[PDB]
Amino acid sequence: TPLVHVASVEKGRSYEDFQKVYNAIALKLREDDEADNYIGYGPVLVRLAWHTSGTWDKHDNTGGSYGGTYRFKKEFNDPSNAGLQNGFKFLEPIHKEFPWISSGDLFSLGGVTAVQEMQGPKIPWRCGRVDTPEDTTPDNGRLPDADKDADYVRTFFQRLNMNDREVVALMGAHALGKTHLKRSGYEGPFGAANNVFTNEFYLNLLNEDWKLEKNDANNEQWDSKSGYMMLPTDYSLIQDPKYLSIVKEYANDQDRFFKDFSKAFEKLLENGITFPKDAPSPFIFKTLEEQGL
Ligand code: HEM
Ligand SMILES: O=C1O[C@H]([C@@H](O)CO)C(O)=C1O
């Protein structure tokens, strides 16, 4: 039997405590509005949560969000994580304000807060991740390659126990922010609204005119007449006929896309964690806007 990670709620903490940590991330998001040319820290926090979760292997329960291992040099220096140090740095003063929260809880809560605060769906979220030692840090190379096709994508995500719908849903996070040539070898915004969470990823894939080109690091990307880009793995969602059908469904139903993404994103952030029968129910946090804050 693989490793077992039992959710253990930070001693004495309840929903109100975590709503505070959320509110502090949310306030700071509002505050550092100007970053990445007025994109903000929203997207990088969404990406930080996915990457700290996306090391999971279903086969042996190694990696995943539970251990908060990104805080160790091997994981924070992962070439795939280039840039994410900004997300870490952003969450640093949050963690000094709320030092009782585990690292895994913080990184994953950062992703939740970012989505909700960019007008994304509500993402139920559970506390109880527990910091694990350095020797538990997963090796580099577990996050995906961008220069690949649909067959790669489908296989890759099987290791995260994600099916076709879950893959297409999670990839709509590429409505957010942009690629940076210095970080990934790709350059450009994915779409128009860079820090507002919509189903624009699917609509753009279908409606724009894309042209495959070599960028300034000699990597291939799909470039639109409108000035957007897609990764080869992004564009594969319309080259594969099963993916294409789901792309069309999300392009044509914002509510279903929100619903599906919420489920898949909670699932991604919870993979590898055992929650006790007596654990609290997932928390649905209020936005600042819903609190009047
Ligand atoms: C086939 C799978 C995926 C590949 C190959 C991939 C690859 C990439 C690359 C190369 C970048 C640009 C990094 C940079 O230069 O700043 C990027 C950005 C981003 N990714 Fe993905 N990604 C994948 C799936 C996902 C998923 C599942 C999520 C979250 C649910 C996600 C969220 C993001 C976000 C928010 C950004 C923009 C961050 C920013 O603006 O700094 N990606 N992705
Ligand atoms: O959301 C984002 O945050 C980082 C930026 O803040 C780094 O300074 C980034 O790349 C985004 O698009």
Query: Residue by residue, what is the 3-state secondary structure of the chain?
Result: CCCCCECCCCCCCCHHHHHHHHHHHHHHHHHCCCHHHHCCCHHHHHHHHHHHHCCCCCCCCCCCHHHCHHHCHHHHCCHHHCCCHHHHHHHHHHHHHCCCCCHHHHHHHHHHHHHHHCCCCCCCECCCCCCCCHHHCCCCCCCCCCCCCHHHHHHHHHCCCCCHHHHHHHHHHHHCCEECHHHHCCCEECCCCCCCCCCHHHHHHHHCCEEEEECCCCCEEEEECCCCEECHHHHHHHHCHHHHHHHHHHHCCHHHHHHHHHHHHHHHHHCCCECCCCCCCCECCCCHHHHCC
Both tokens of 290, joined, read: 């819903």
Q: How far apart are CA 103 and CA 53, in angstroms?
A: 12
Distance CA 157, CA 166 (A): 9
Q: Among 80, 168, 174, which is best to mutate for testing ligand 1, by the most ligand atoms less than 8 A from CB?
A: 174
Q: How far is CA 93 from CA 33, 198, 251, 287, in A?
A: 16, 29, 38, 20
Mutate to test the pocket of ligand 2, among 31, 39, 84, 186 (most ligand atoms within 8 A of CB): 39
Cα-Cα-Cα-Cα torsion 242, 247, 249, 251, nearest 10 degrees, comes to -170
Residue 234, phi-psi category: left (phi > 0), alpha (psi -120 to 50), beta (remainder): alpha
Q: What is the CATH number of domain 3-143+265-293?
A: 1.10.520.10
Report whether residue 180 contacts ligand 1, using a CB cutoff of 6 Å. Answer: yes
Euclidean distance between CA atoms 78 and 91, whole angstroms = 19
Q: How far is CA 211 from CA 78, 96, 144, in A?
A: 30, 46, 23
Report resolution (Å) to 1 decimal. Answer: 2.0
Identify how the structure was determined.
X-ray
Is 215 exposed, middle or buried (CB count within 10 Å of its CB: 0-12, 13-18, 19+)? middle
Q: Cα of 179 to ligand 1 centre, how many Å?
A: 8
Cα of 281 from ligand 2 centre, angstroms: 32
Closest CA to 106 of 24, 187, 43: 24
Exposure of 96 in the CB half-sphere (CA atoms within 13 A): 5
Name the closest-CA residue to atom 3, ligand 2: 41
Pairing of strands 220-224, 210-214: antiparallel
Q: In terms of Cα–Cα distance, which of 272, 233, 247, 288 is closest to 128?
A: 272
Output phi, psi for 26, to 5 deg. -60, -40
- What's the chain's Rg over C-alpha atoms? 18
Closest of 137, 66, 136, 131 to residue 99, by C-alpha: 131
Residue with tokens 């502090």: 24
Q: Is there an atom of ligand 1 within 6 Å of 52 CB?
A: no
Q: Is 21 in the pocket of ligand 1 (CB under 6 A)?
A: no
Name which residue sits closest to atom 12 of ligand 2, judged by CA: 177
CA dist 208 → 44, 82, 161, 203, 204 (Å): 25, 29, 31, 8, 5
Residue ID of nearest Cα to ligand 2 atom 5: 36
> Is residue 35 lining ligand 2, measured as CB closer than 6 Å?
yes
Cα 116-118-119 angle, rounded to 5 deg:
65
Domain 144-264, classified CATH 1.10.420.10, yes or no: yes
Residue entry with tokens 């930080």? 48
Q: From the CB of 144, is ligand 1 less than 6 Å away?
A: yes
Asked if 3-143+265-293 and 144-264 have one fold, the answer is: no
Task: Give me the residue label for tokens 């080869």.
Answer: 232
CA-to-CA distance for 242 and 222, rounded, in angstroms? 20
Ligand 2 center to 193 CA (angstroms): 14
Cα–Cα distances in Å, from 241 out to 53, 151, 216, 233, 236? Answer: 28, 11, 31, 14, 9
Cβ atoms of 65 and 6 within 8 Å: the answer is no
Tokens of 270: 């919870």
Q: Report yes or no: 199 and 175 within 8 Å, Cβ to Cβ.
A: yes
Cβ(101)–Cβ(14) below 8 Å? no
- Please check whether residue 197 is in contact with residue 119, taking contact to mean a CB–CB distance below 8 angstroms: yes
How many Cα atoms occupy the beta-carbon half-sphere of 102 within 13 Å?
22
Gap between the Cα atoms of 266 and 151, Å rounded = 25
Domain coordinates of the chain in residue numbers? Answer: 3-143+265-293, 144-264
Regarding the beta carbon of 51 and ligand 1, being less than 6 Å apart is answered no
Would you tell me how many other CB atoms lie within 10 Å of the CB of residue 145? 13
Under 8 Å between Cβ of 201 and 190: yes
Q: Is the CB of 229 under 6 A from ligand 1?
A: no
